[PDB]
Design a protein around this ligand. Structure first.
Ligand SMILES: O=C1CCc2ccc(OCCCCN3CCN(c4cccc(Cl)c4Cl)CC3)cc2N1
Ligand SMILES: COc1c(C)c2c(c(O)c1C/C=C(\C)CCC(=O)O)C(=O)OC2
Length: 548
């Protein structure tokens, strides 16, 4: 339409619009109180209704960026992003998006406290959810956040009328919260690939993953879906959230109305309501690959004639054909195979006798031996021992990395052994390798915020695919001569916290111990980690309390 806001408002409805806009505000200005934005959002919503009645009305033709930026610049904690033209302002807000914004961790009130607030003002409760999530996750998938919001509303609507509200609601919120971090982590990688590597980098990745999942589809179908997807995530990762959710609603539409040309596993995904549609398709299982499929063609003579007539379309089709056949090959491995074949086709183009042994070119043996060998060690140590085993070997590599970043990163890295070492041989690499680069991007984004090491940054700026191999061969930091002591930190209130929170601290000290004593042997190191745990347990099981 002529007016932009009215088009989105109509398509999405007032409910989603209101939610989508609020999420937009919370992700730009992450510091502003809950109440102050709510005021801004409703003003935009109320104004949105003006343009719906009549698009000709003043200020309606304005772009979504302009309208949003104007109402935000109305609220020493001043970066001063209110800097003239919209190409500058919006990109400014995008620039300032704090991955780790430093906000108090919200504590979870008692079940009875939360249920009553749900009966008082149910609207306010759900808004505070979108608010607090969008603040601490500025690169969260907005339309995926709307889905989680509804599920949040379902848990309270169901449990708070139960006999035992605490046994119902708590298992779920913990479940929702785990999925929250996962949905956030995964979506940050999609924004990193785009904004730090390029649209072609995102297209390539998308082609590969889709191909494995919709192998029954023709090439241009997947090619279509890649274009449509890239446009959704680009909109989302750039603040244009309204266009993001709107397109994604349209994306699922065109998909469910063309299932037979795409996949068979969308059967009941398209049974679920509007939001539940998008979520299902995103996670949908890989469709069975068609039987009686060729391999190659045994190299063709017209290889360089077709590679020059449509390079990307060829390489894309290569990627399509190869990925659709190998559900067991990780996207990272596949992109390596696609990049090894492209450079072979660049130098060689007697071409035939040059690119004959390309498919003979080891890239596959590396991840295989990686997963098999490590899951062995993970079975030997266990999650908390493997985490601990990694916390040392990684602080060793880069002691300069802040302890918090070392902990969470190393924590989440070990958790690979719990997630993917369960699957058969075939479902490991699509699980592990993919999940690894997600956690690896966590480090990169945290590090990029407060950088203190070149080795870490070297891998992050390098090829996204080569991140893992690069990080595994950073050697051990020798020039870490200064290893200053820490008096106050070791001094352990720690007994009112959950068992999980307790271990996290015990792991915080593990890093600090190596940061003070790098060359300290793991044999004398292991002794300290056992006693320090034996001390905390002993001095709280006793009537010492806060004296020991
Ligand atoms: O913040 C820091 C400080 C500096 C630093 C240096 C190196 C580094 O290592 C990344 C490269 C190895 C990746 N491992 C490979 C093994 N892997 C694993 C775990 C369980 C099961 C399975 Cl199957 C597997 Cl493969 C976990 C991920 C991390 C850090 N991090
Ligand atoms: C498997 O998820 C990925 C990942 C991990 C990456 C990329 C990617 O495109 C997708 C597919 C995108 C999806 C499923 C959108 C969901 C929907 O369909 O609504 C990428 O380029 O970097 C990494």
């Amino acid at each position: 339409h002529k007016s932009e806001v009215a088009h989105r408002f109509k398509d999405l409805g007032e409910e989603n619009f209101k939610a989508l806009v609020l999420i937009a505000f919370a992700q730009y200005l992450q510091q502003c109180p809950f109440e102050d934005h709510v005021k801004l959002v409703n003003e935009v919503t109320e104004f949105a209704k003006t343009c719906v009645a009549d698009e000709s009305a003043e200020n309606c033709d304005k772009s979504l960026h302009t309208l949003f930026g104007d109402k935000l610049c109305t609220v020493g904690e001043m970066a001063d992003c209110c800097a003239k033209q919209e190409p500058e302002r919006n990109e400014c807000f995008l620039q300032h998006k704090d991955d780790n914004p430093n906000l108090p961790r919200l504590v979870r009130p008692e079940v009875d406290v939360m249920c009553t607030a749900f009966h008082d003002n149910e609207e306010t409760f759900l808004k505070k959810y979108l608010y607090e999530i969008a603040r601490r996750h500025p690169y969260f998938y907005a339309p995926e956040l709307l889905f989680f919001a509804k599920r949040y509303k379902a848990a309270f609507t169901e449990c708070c009328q139960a006999a035992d509200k605490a046994a119902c609601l708590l298992p779920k919120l913990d479940e929702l919260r785990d999925e929250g971090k996962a949905s956030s982590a995964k979506q940050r990688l999609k924004c990193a690939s785009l904004q730090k590597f390029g649209e072609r980098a995102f297209k390539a990745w998308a082609v590969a993953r889709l191909s494995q999942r919709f192998p029954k589809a023709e090439f241009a179908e997947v090619s279509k879906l890649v274009t449509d997807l890239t446009k959704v995530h680009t909109e989302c990762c750039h603040g244009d959230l309204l266009e993001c959710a709107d397109d994604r609603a349209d994306l699922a539409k065109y998909i469910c109305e063309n299932q037979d040309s795409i996949s068979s596993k969308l059967k009941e995904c398209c049974e679920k309501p509007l939001l539940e549609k998008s979520h299902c398709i995103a996670e949908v299982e890989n469709d069975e690959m068609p039987a009686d499929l060729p391999s190659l063609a045994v190299e063709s003579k017209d290889v360089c004639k077709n590679y020059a007539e449509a390079k990307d379309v060829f390489l894309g089709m290569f990627l399509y054909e190869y990925a659709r056949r190998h559900p067991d090959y990780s996207v990272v491995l596949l992109l390596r195979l696609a990049k090894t074949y492209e450079t072979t086709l660049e130098k060689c183009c007697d071409p035939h006798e040059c690119y004959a042994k390309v498919f003979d070119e080891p890239l596959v043996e590396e991840p295989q031996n990686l997963i098999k060998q490590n899951c062995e060690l993970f079975e030997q140590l266990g999650e908390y021992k493997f985490q601990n085993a990694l916390l040392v070997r990684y602080t060793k590599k880069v002691p300069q990395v802040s302890t918090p970043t070392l902990v969470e990163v190393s924590r989440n890295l070990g958790k690979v052994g719990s997630k993917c070492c369960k699957h058969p041989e075939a479902k490991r690499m699509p699980c592990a390798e993919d999940y690894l680069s997600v956690v690896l991007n966590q480090l990169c984004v945290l590090h990029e915020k407060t950088p203190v090491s070149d080795r870490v940054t070297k891998c992050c700026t390098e090829s996204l695919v080569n991140r893992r191999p690069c990080f595994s061969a950073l050697e051990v930091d020798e020039t870490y001569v200064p290893k200053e002591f820490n008096a106050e930190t070791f001094t352990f209130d720690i007994c009112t916290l959950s068992e999980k929170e307790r271990q996290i601290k015990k792991q915080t000290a593990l890093v600090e111990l190596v940061k003070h004593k790098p060359k300290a042997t793991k044999e004398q190191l292991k002794a300290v980690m056992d006693d320090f745990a034996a001390f905390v347990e002993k001095c709280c099981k006793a009537d010492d309390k806060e004296t020991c």
